[PDB]
mmCIF file of C-alpha atoms and ligand atoms in Angstrom:
data_model
loop_
_atom_site.group_PDB
_atom_site.id
_atom_site.type_symbol
_atom_site.label_atom_id
_atom_site.label_comp_id
_atom_site.label_asym_id
_atom_site.label_seq_id
_atom_site.Cartn_x
_atom_site.Cartn_y
_atom_site.Cartn_z
ATOM 1 C CA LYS A 1 -22.210 -11.250 2.129
ATOM 2 C CA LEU A 2 -19.200 -8.931 2.516
ATOM 3 C CA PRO A 3 -17.981 -5.737 0.766
ATOM 4 C CA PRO A 4 -16.020 -5.967 -2.533
ATOM 5 C CA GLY A 5 -13.088 -8.360 -2.355
ATOM 6 C CA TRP A 6 -13.330 -9.663 1.227
ATOM 7 C CA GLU A 7 -13.300 -13.280 2.375
ATOM 8 C CA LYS A 8 -13.075 -15.194 5.643
ATOM 9 C CA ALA A 9 -9.881 -16.906 6.749
ATOM 10 C CA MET A 10 -8.557 -18.678 9.828
ATOM 11 C CA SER A 11 -5.426 -17.638 11.696
ATOM 12 C CA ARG A 12 -2.783 -20.366 11.644
ATOM 13 C CA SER A 13 -1.440 -19.403 15.056
ATOM 14 C CA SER A 14 -4.616 -18.695 17.066
ATOM 15 C CA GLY A 15 -7.410 -20.383 15.129
ATOM 16 C CA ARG A 16 -9.351 -17.118 15.247
ATOM 17 C CA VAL A 17 -11.299 -16.089 12.155
ATOM 18 C CA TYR A 18 -10.134 -12.974 10.346
ATOM 19 C CA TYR A 19 -10.970 -11.167 7.123
ATOM 20 C CA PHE A 20 -8.746 -10.679 4.072
ATOM 21 C CA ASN A 21 -9.248 -8.506 0.974
ATOM 22 C CA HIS A 22 -7.673 -9.935 -2.169
ATOM 23 C CA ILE A 23 -7.753 -6.569 -4.004
ATOM 24 C CA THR A 24 -6.085 -4.421 -1.340
ATOM 25 C CA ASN A 25 -4.221 -7.226 0.521
ATOM 26 C CA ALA A 26 -5.583 -5.747 3.762
ATOM 27 C CA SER A 27 -6.293 -8.084 6.665
ATOM 28 C CA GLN A 28 -8.084 -7.433 9.960
ATOM 29 C CA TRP A 29 -9.833 -9.253 12.806
ATOM 30 C CA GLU A 30 -13.128 -7.340 12.650
ATOM 31 C CA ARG A 31 -15.894 -7.988 10.112
ATOM 32 C CA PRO A 32 -15.497 -5.343 7.359
ATOM 33 C CA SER A 33 -17.828 -2.347 7.537
ATOM 34 C CA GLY A 34 -21.004 -1.994 5.461
ATOM 35 C CA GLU A 35 -18.130 3.665 -6.326
ATOM 36 C CA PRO A 36 -17.021 7.315 -6.497
ATOM 37 C CA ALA A 37 -15.665 9.030 -9.577
ATOM 38 C CA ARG A 38 -12.422 9.918 -7.806
ATOM 39 C CA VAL A 39 -10.374 9.014 -4.735
ATOM 40 C CA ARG A 40 -7.406 10.690 -3.070
ATOM 41 C CA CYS A 41 -4.526 8.517 -1.842
ATOM 42 C CA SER A 42 -1.087 8.650 -0.326
ATOM 43 C CA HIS A 43 1.423 5.863 -0.755
ATOM 44 C CA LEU A 44 4.784 4.592 0.457
ATOM 45 C CA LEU A 45 6.718 2.888 -2.345
ATOM 46 C CA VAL A 46 9.639 0.505 -1.901
ATOM 47 C CA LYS A 47 11.420 -0.177 -5.165
ATOM 48 C CA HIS A 48 13.514 -3.250 -5.968
ATOM 49 C CA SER A 49 16.015 -4.330 -8.608
ATOM 50 C CA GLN A 50 13.213 -5.393 -10.992
ATOM 51 C CA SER A 51 11.328 -2.105 -10.727
ATOM 52 C CA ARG A 52 10.661 -0.439 -14.078
ATOM 53 C CA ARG A 53 13.114 2.308 -13.041
ATOM 54 C CA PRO A 54 15.408 0.953 -10.271
ATOM 55 C CA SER A 55 16.386 4.402 -9.043
ATOM 56 C CA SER A 56 14.958 7.006 -6.698
ATOM 57 C CA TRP A 57 15.722 10.178 -4.776
ATOM 58 C CA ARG A 58 16.941 7.934 -1.930
ATOM 59 C CA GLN A 59 19.269 5.782 -4.063
ATOM 60 C CA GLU A 60 20.817 6.260 -7.495
ATOM 61 C CA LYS A 61 21.040 2.466 -8.017
ATOM 62 C CA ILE A 62 18.359 0.421 -6.240
ATOM 63 C CA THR A 63 19.758 -3.070 -5.718
ATOM 64 C CA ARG A 64 17.510 -4.678 -3.083
ATOM 65 C CA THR A 65 15.598 -7.760 -4.169
ATOM 66 C CA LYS A 66 11.823 -7.945 -4.447
ATOM 67 C CA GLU A 67 11.757 -10.200 -1.387
ATOM 68 C CA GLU A 68 13.870 -7.700 0.580
ATOM 69 C CA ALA A 69 11.520 -4.894 -0.500
ATOM 70 C CA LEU A 70 8.540 -6.907 0.734
ATOM 71 C CA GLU A 71 10.244 -7.383 4.099
ATOM 72 C CA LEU A 72 10.712 -3.611 4.424
ATOM 73 C CA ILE A 73 7.056 -2.996 3.467
ATOM 74 C CA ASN A 74 5.911 -5.585 5.996
ATOM 75 C CA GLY A 75 7.935 -3.874 8.733
ATOM 76 C CA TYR A 76 6.517 -0.444 7.904
ATOM 77 C CA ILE A 77 3.006 -1.898 8.038
ATOM 78 C CA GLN A 78 3.698 -3.384 11.488
ATOM 79 C CA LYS A 79 4.898 -0.041 12.895
ATOM 80 C CA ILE A 80 1.962 1.868 11.376
ATOM 81 C CA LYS A 81 -0.524 -0.645 12.812
ATOM 82 C CA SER A 82 1.118 -0.554 16.267
ATOM 83 C CA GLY A 83 1.140 3.268 16.280
ATOM 84 C CA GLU A 84 4.888 3.239 16.872
ATOM 85 C CA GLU A 85 5.188 5.242 13.627
ATOM 86 C CA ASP A 86 2.803 7.302 11.485
ATOM 87 C CA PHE A 87 2.228 6.487 7.813
ATOM 88 C CA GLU A 88 3.126 10.056 6.814
ATOM 89 C CA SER A 89 6.377 9.945 8.767
ATOM 90 C CA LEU A 90 7.492 6.649 7.201
ATOM 91 C CA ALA A 91 6.514 7.813 3.719
ATOM 92 C CA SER A 92 8.481 11.046 4.074
ATOM 93 C CA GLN A 93 11.604 9.180 5.215
ATOM 94 C CA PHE A 94 11.512 5.962 3.209
ATOM 95 C CA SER A 95 9.240 6.087 0.135
ATOM 96 C CA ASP A 96 11.148 5.681 -3.140
ATOM 97 C CA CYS A 97 8.564 7.942 -4.831
ATOM 98 C CA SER A 98 9.071 11.692 -5.268
ATOM 99 C CA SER A 99 5.749 12.052 -3.423
ATOM 100 C CA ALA A 100 7.729 11.360 -0.225
ATOM 101 C CA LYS A 101 8.280 15.144 -0.088
ATOM 102 C CA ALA A 102 4.494 15.546 0.318
ATOM 103 C CA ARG A 103 4.136 12.828 2.995
ATOM 104 C CA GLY A 104 3.213 10.417 0.194
ATOM 105 C CA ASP A 105 0.194 12.357 -1.090
ATOM 106 C CA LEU A 106 -0.632 11.725 -4.751
ATOM 107 C CA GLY A 107 -3.740 13.927 -4.838
ATOM 108 C CA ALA A 108 -7.015 12.836 -6.372
ATOM 109 C CA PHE A 109 -7.418 10.651 -9.455
ATOM 110 C CA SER A 110 -9.901 8.691 -11.577
ATOM 111 C CA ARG A 111 -9.868 5.187 -12.980
ATOM 112 C CA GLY A 112 -7.533 4.812 -15.956
ATOM 113 C CA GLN A 113 -4.729 7.026 -14.621
ATOM 114 C CA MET A 114 -2.686 4.761 -12.321
ATOM 115 C CA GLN A 115 -1.239 1.305 -12.812
ATOM 116 C CA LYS A 116 -4.034 -1.221 -12.554
ATOM 117 C CA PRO A 117 -3.190 -3.010 -9.256
ATOM 118 C CA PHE A 118 -2.702 0.375 -7.587
ATOM 119 C CA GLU A 119 -5.947 1.731 -9.029
ATOM 120 C CA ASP A 120 -7.955 -1.343 -8.054
ATOM 121 C CA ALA A 121 -6.655 -1.290 -4.473
ATOM 122 C CA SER A 122 -7.223 2.481 -4.169
ATOM 123 C CA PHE A 123 -10.870 2.261 -5.218
ATOM 124 C CA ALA A 124 -11.576 -0.826 -3.081
ATOM 125 C CA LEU A 125 -10.278 0.939 0.051
ATOM 126 C CA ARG A 126 -12.822 2.771 2.168
ATOM 127 C CA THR A 127 -12.021 6.328 3.232
ATOM 128 C CA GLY A 128 -9.322 6.203 5.895
ATOM 129 C CA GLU A 129 -8.369 2.567 5.179
ATOM 130 C CA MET A 130 -4.860 1.275 4.441
ATOM 131 C CA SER A 131 -3.878 -1.453 1.997
ATOM 132 C CA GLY A 132 -1.500 -4.308 2.516
ATOM 133 C CA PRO A 133 1.427 -4.764 0.112
ATOM 134 C CA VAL A 134 0.292 -3.911 -3.428
ATOM 135 C CA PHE A 135 2.551 -4.970 -6.307
ATOM 136 C CA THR A 136 3.021 -2.932 -9.505
ATOM 137 C CA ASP A 137 5.717 -2.509 -12.108
ATOM 138 C CA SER A 138 7.130 0.316 -9.947
ATOM 139 C CA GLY A 139 7.670 -1.833 -6.881
ATOM 140 C CA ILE A 140 5.673 -2.541 -3.716
ATOM 141 C CA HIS A 141 3.223 0.033 -2.275
ATOM 142 C CA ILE A 142 1.414 0.744 0.956
ATOM 143 C CA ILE A 143 -1.667 2.781 -0.017
ATOM 144 C CA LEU A 144 -3.665 5.068 2.293
ATOM 145 C CA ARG A 145 -7.000 6.330 0.996
ATOM 146 C CA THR A 146 -7.558 9.838 2.368
ATOM 147 C CA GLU A 147 -10.644 10.961 0.377
HETATM 148 O O1 LIG B 1 7.619 16.150 -10.024
HETATM 149 C C1 LIG B 1 6.884 16.871 -9.048
HETATM 150 C C2 LIG B 1 5.403 16.615 -9.140
HETATM 151 C C3 LIG B 1 4.515 17.343 -8.369
HETATM 152 C C4 LIG B 1 3.154 17.109 -8.452
HETATM 153 C C5 LIG B 1 2.674 16.145 -9.312
HETATM 154 C C6 LIG B 1 3.537 15.387 -10.097
HETATM 155 C C7 LIG B 1 3.020 14.350 -11.015
HETATM 156 C C8 LIG B 1 3.781 13.270 -11.426
HETATM 157 N N1 LIG B 1 3.323 12.312 -12.242
HETATM 158 C C9 LIG B 1 2.065 12.449 -12.643
HETATM 159 N N2 LIG B 1 1.232 13.430 -12.317
HETATM 160 C C10 LIG B 1 1.722 14.365 -11.493
HETATM 161 C C11 LIG B 1 4.906 15.641 -9.998
HETATM 162 O O1 LIG B 2 -0.097 10.905 -10.023
HETATM 163 C C1 LIG B 2 0.245 12.018 -9.212
HETATM 164 C C2 LIG B 2 1.669 11.940 -8.730
HETATM 165 C C3 LIG B 2 2.502 10.914 -9.137
HETATM 166 C C4 LIG B 2 3.810 10.851 -8.691
HETATM 167 C C5 LIG B 2 4.299 11.819 -7.836
HETATM 168 C C6 LIG B 2 3.488 12.861 -7.395
HETATM 169 C C7 LIG B 2 4.006 13.908 -6.486
HETATM 170 C C8 LIG B 2 3.177 14.673 -5.690
HETATM 171 N N1 LIG B 2 3.621 15.625 -4.866
HETATM 172 C C9 LIG B 2 4.935 15.795 -4.841
HETATM 173 N N2 LIG B 2 5.838 15.132 -5.546
HETATM 174 C C10 LIG B 2 5.355 14.183 -6.356
HETATM 175 C C11 LIG B 2 2.174 12.908 -7.866
#
């Protein structure tokens, strides 16, 4: 019926159908369009107090809760989707990953290299697509597939 991981849902506030991907946590109004050895992705990471290493170049001691980190991620997603801010700009300023210095770019990678929820979301994204919040032991990610 639909590409890998998509399903139909109904908006609670408008009653309009929309589509949700349970691998990438992406959601959109339009019916999704239409696997490679490698993909290239950027990401924006927001760590929390239960992250494997609760520290980053932004903060020596990361104390925000998981729920607070999800609220920050959700806000970044809203501004990217509105065009008020670019993904690269938010990643450079606010990602808790060292890759912030490269606008979030991780380069290319194969299956078996990244943490599994990150890998699965990366490979389920189509080129140019953005994930919703993706949870790993490092924290919460927004993933952008660039190649
Ligand atoms: O630390 C700077 C830097 C630059 C470029 C790549 C990495 C890296 C990190 N972890 C796994 N693989 C590659 C790190
Ligand atoms: O897995 C690749 C990887 C992982 C984590 C960080 C990087 C990176 C890239 N560019 C600049 N700084 C850090 C790359």
